[PDB]
């Protein structure tokens, strides 16, 4: 009994329905074995030689993918385009009346029948926004306890305790600005936040694999720039639409604008370039516009907050401002403890003074290196700053410490230890290696300063009250 | 049971009808049940294996769409161009022979049959921006009464009293501009007027939400800019044609342009690109020209008043230039009243002194907090503006205040209260929390200003007569 197939079009009260079969629309009745009321629009139905419906199947078909333009007002038809710029009106299938249909999403359609059976999600895919989940967590960051607590309260706390916020009628923050001097650590906090969000999406909800990758859309500054008129705005609109559609109630979606300073410069600044007067308005309109974000947090990291446009830094778009400060002695000790773990090989001669106590030996070495870096001696005298009044203020290397510098010191000490292992054969790490690494780094950073340098005047002249007019390098050699 | 279908073409006096079916045109006889008088050209009919018309039906609803090219003299036919530049003469069905089928309309058509039925463009995506109507109304905006009065007189008043305007021969304003410092509340009014218009359309015409939302368009700014030459101007022309079509001298259509400086400039300030040099004349012609928009109101919001082209900032295009100023003490009190609602939980410590009177306690707290933030004390000193003349001026945090800052302070106070109730278990917002939030906010927004900022210092420099040369943060 050969049985054919056709596409259901509409249902009627006479228990008879219209089916597109063999390229023609036929009004046919239904067999008693199948309910006509249970049928749905755009359904693949089975027929026979007598032209009678006997079975209805799934909405599976092979069809061309057309870019959705707009749904009609009646809500049953939509306009789509084709490869040859051919526009057609097509009825929506039952599953497409499910996430809200949006323009720019490919729909599988057969032009002969004009039915969009399903929507292909992978056709509109963005891999540039997706970022690999870093291994860094909150425990791997030290010396920024207040900043970590503040960012936790800004991001994770509202979604963990939603009933209390609803009771107090409080909405989650709509933007965080992490800013500070170079090397003090801003990408690290972003990595920790991304890892925490990945854990929350993986183990707390248990949706599936790769779900963590979907959240935390990461984009850098220069990535958005294109070579066209009104194309970067298209990228902004697409990424914000993706963030809006992916976010749900209590579901946090974070967009990270790493290196915020370079892009989105203050409007009217920069003779050479003019892209700001187009990119910045789009961002200002997407965030806190006529239609606002529901559960989207925008995180911006910048070494030059002053350079960022004042219209975006005002409350309502970047509410929580977090400033990363240069490490002090206690922060330096914490950072060193974050790197000089007990798993590093220690020389037997190193452990001799403490009878093999690795923890005490490491703590003592950390204290010694911190004291060496934070000692005001002629060895640590870096620069002298002379103002208009003529008074000289001596700035040491301690004023230019950073987590990157500490990591480089530790890595240089490890490299020197491995060189000692290769040459002399004695394994382990030595405190004198750390002292030599300190000396080498502070001697290497001697030629960095120039006549005018950034990041120091805003923190020095404010307390001094005098404009910086000269900087002199101290004793050489 | 097996019955075919076909498309009606024309009728005759012989009780015969021409039907297109199976890719061929035939002439057929109607069943006695159906009367040929009620038939109209283009109607879909049902056939049978005996080839007899049995019942009429609604017109076809899907198929290829083809832009209308021209209307023929007879009126029964029109020339339409296909997707690949193919031109065909096709009959006009009954529904098109409502709003005139003006040229430039992509008409739904069947090439094989040769008949038209309907049309539409991409400008409707603007209506898709306002899918959700904001619930904020004029009652939720505080500190602005003259501005709200002006915006109501510009929009709601002309349509509230048509006869009075007709007697005085006065037409509704063609355009409204809103300008002011960032965060002062321009978008609040922009969305409140849209909410009011949606409410009016829902209550007057019909309860359907889509039609009510269809009378407000949200440009969003640089959304018009396109890759290809001459397509953005076509988009603007389509938007204004859509606006003019919905107008009926009693139903306003509000097209809201956000961040006017994004797409409008002085035609010479463009350095990297000069797309505005072509965009601006198109909009100027659309707004006022040989044919002028009778009943369309254009509302623009911007943060840079001067950067807009002088032609747009002209009477007859942007009639009323509403200026929104930074809140004063009374405006701050109004905003705090709008935010610190009476229903918020309050600690029993605060209610002990005022016998649990929530309203009086909240009013006293609002007055105390606004007095604290509007205080000329050395702790509130922010910047020292200098001039070539030498009249150094000390500015306070109160000068750089807005409704957004007040909302942020309230949110921070609520967060502190929620942290306190989580750690200790005693609920209720406290007065000291607001003071702590104020000082923390003024500390957080300290190192904002750059070397030179034309945001709001240009007006002060012009007032003093000299230009700013140095500014420093006066903290510690």
């Amino acid at each position: 009994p050969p049985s054919g197939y056709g596409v259901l079009l509409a249902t009627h009260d006479d228990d008879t329905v219209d089916v597109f079969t063999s390229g023609r629309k036929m009004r046919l009745t239904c067999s008693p074995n199948i309910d006509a009321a249970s049928l749905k629009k755009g359904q693949t139905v089975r027929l026979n030689e007598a032209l009678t419906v006997v079975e209805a199947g799934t909405f599976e078909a092979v069809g061309e993918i057309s870019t959705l333009r707009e749904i009609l007002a009646d809500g049953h038809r939509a306009l789509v385009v084709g490869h040859a710029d051919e526009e057609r009106v097509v009825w929506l299938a039952d599953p497409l009346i499910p996430r809200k249909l949006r323009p720019g999403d490919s729909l599988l359609v057969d032009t002969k029948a004009g039915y969009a059976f399903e929507r292909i999600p992978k056709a509109e895919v963005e891999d540039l926004v997706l970022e690999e989940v870093p291994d860094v967590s909150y425990a791997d960051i030290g010396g920024l306890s207040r900043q970590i607590e503040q960012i936790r309260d800004a991001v994770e706390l509202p979604f963990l305790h939603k009933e209390l916020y609803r009771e107090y009628s409080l909405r989650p923050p709509k933007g965080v600005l992490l800013y500070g001097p170079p090397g003090c650590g801003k990408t690290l906090i972003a990595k920790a936040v991304a890892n925490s969000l990945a854990k929350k999406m993986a183990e707390v909800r248990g949706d599936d694999a790769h779900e963590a990758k979907s959240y935390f859309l990461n984009i850098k500054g220069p990535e958005l720039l294109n070579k066209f008129v009104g194309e970067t705005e298209r990228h902004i609109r697409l990424i914000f639409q993706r963030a809006r559609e992916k976010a749900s109630e209590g579901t946090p979606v974070i967009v990270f604008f790493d290196e915020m300073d370079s892009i989105f410069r203050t409007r009217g600044t920069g003779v050479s370039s003019d892209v700001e007067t187009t990119v910045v308005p789009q961002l200002l309109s997407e965030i806190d516009g006529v239609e606002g974000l529901e559960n989207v947090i925008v995180i911006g990291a910048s070494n030059r907050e002053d350079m960022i446009d004042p219209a975006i830094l005002r409350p309502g778009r970047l509410d929580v401002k977090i400033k990363i400060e240069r490490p002090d002695a206690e922060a330096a000790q914490d950072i060193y403890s974050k790197y000089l773990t007990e798993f590093l090989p220690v020389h037997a001669d190193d452990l001799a003074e403490f009878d093999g106590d690795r923890s005490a030996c490491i703590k003592a070495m950390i204290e010694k290196v911190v004291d060496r870096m934070y000692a005001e001696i002629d060895d640590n005298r870096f620069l002298e700053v002379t103002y208009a009044n003529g008074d000289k203020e001596v700035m040491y290397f301690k004023d230019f410490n950073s987590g990157a510098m500490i990591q480089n010191v530790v890595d240089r000490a490890k490299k020197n230890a491995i060189k000692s292992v290769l040459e002399t054969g004695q394994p382990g790490l030595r405190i004198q290696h750390l002292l030599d690494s300190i000396v080498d780094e502070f001697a290497e950073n001697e030629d960095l300063p120039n006549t005018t340098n950034p990041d120091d005047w805003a923190r020095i002249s404010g307390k001094k009250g005098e404009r910086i007019v000269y900087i002199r390098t101290l004793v050489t050699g | 049971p097996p019955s075919g279908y076909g498309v009606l073409l024309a009728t005759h006096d012989d009780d015969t009808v021409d039907v297109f079916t199976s890719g061929r045109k035939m002439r057929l006889t109607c069943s006695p049940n159906i009367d040929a008088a009620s038939l109209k050209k283009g109607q879909t009919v049902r056939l049978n294996e005996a080839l007899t018309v049995v019942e009429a039906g609604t017109f076809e609803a899907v198929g290829e769409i083809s832009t209308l090219r021209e209307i023929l003299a007879d009126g029964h036919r029109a020339l339409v161009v296909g997707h690949a530049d193919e031109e065909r003469v096709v009959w006009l069905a009954d529904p098109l022979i409502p709003r005139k089928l003006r040229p430039g309309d992509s008409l739904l058509v069947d090439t094989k049959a040769g008949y038209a039925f309907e049309r539409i463009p991409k400008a409707e995506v603007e209506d898709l921006v306002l899918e959700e109507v904001p619930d904020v109304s004029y009652a939720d905006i505080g500190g602005l009464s003259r501005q709200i009065e002006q915006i109501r007189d510009a929009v709601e008043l002309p349509f509230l009293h048509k006869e009075l305007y007709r007697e005085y021969s006065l037409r509704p304003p063609k355009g409204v501009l809103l300008y002011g410092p960032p965060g002062c509340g321009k978008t609040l009014i922009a969305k409140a007027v849209a909410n009011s218009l949606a409410k009016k359309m829902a209550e007057v015409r019909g309860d359907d939400a889509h039609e009510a939302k269809s009378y407000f368009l949200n440009i969003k700014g640089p959304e018009l800019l396109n890759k290809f030459v001459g397509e953005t101007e076509r988009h603007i022309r389509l938007i204004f044609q859509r606006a003019r079509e919905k107008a009926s001298e009693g139903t306003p259509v509000i097209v809201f342009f956000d961040e006017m400086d994004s797409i409008f400039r002085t035609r010479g300030t463009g350095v990297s690109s000069d797309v505005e040099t072509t965009v601006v004349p198109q909009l100027l012609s659309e707004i006022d020209g040989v044919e002028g928009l009778e009943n369309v109101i254009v509302i623009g919001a911007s943060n840079r008043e001067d950067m807009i082209d002088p032609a747009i900032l002209r009477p007859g295009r942007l009639d009323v230039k509403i200026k929104i100023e930074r809140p004063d003490a009374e405006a701050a009190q109004d905003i705090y009243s709008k935010y610190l609602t009476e229903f918020l939980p309050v600690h029993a410590d605060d209610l002990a002194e005022f016998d649990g009177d929530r309203s009086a306690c909240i009013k006293a707290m609002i007055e105390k907090v606004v007095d604290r933030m509007y205080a000329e004390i050395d702790d509130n000193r922010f910047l020292e503006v200098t001039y070539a003349n030498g009249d150094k001026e000390v500015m306070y945090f109160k000068d750089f205040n807005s409704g957004a800052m007040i909302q942020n302070v309230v949110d921070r106070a609520k967060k502190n209260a929620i942290k306190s109730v989580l750690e200790t278990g005693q609920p209720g917002l406290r007065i000291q929390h607001l003071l702590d939030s104020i000082v923390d906010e003024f500390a957080e927004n300290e190192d904002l200003p750059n070397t030179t900022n034309p945001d709001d210092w240009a007006r002060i420099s012009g007032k003093k007569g000299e230009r700013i040369v140095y500014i420093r943060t006066l903290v510690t």
Binding site: A84, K227, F228, V229, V271, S272, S273, D274, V275 | A84, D85, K227, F228, V229, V271, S272, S273, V275
Partner: peptide, 17 residues
């Protein structure tokens, strides 16, 4: 040498079936 954007102009293509 200020960097400048561009706007392209499409050329029609001939396609049958």
């Amino acid at each position: 040498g200020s960097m400048a954007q561009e706007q392209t102009k499409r050329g029609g293509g001939g396609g049958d079936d």
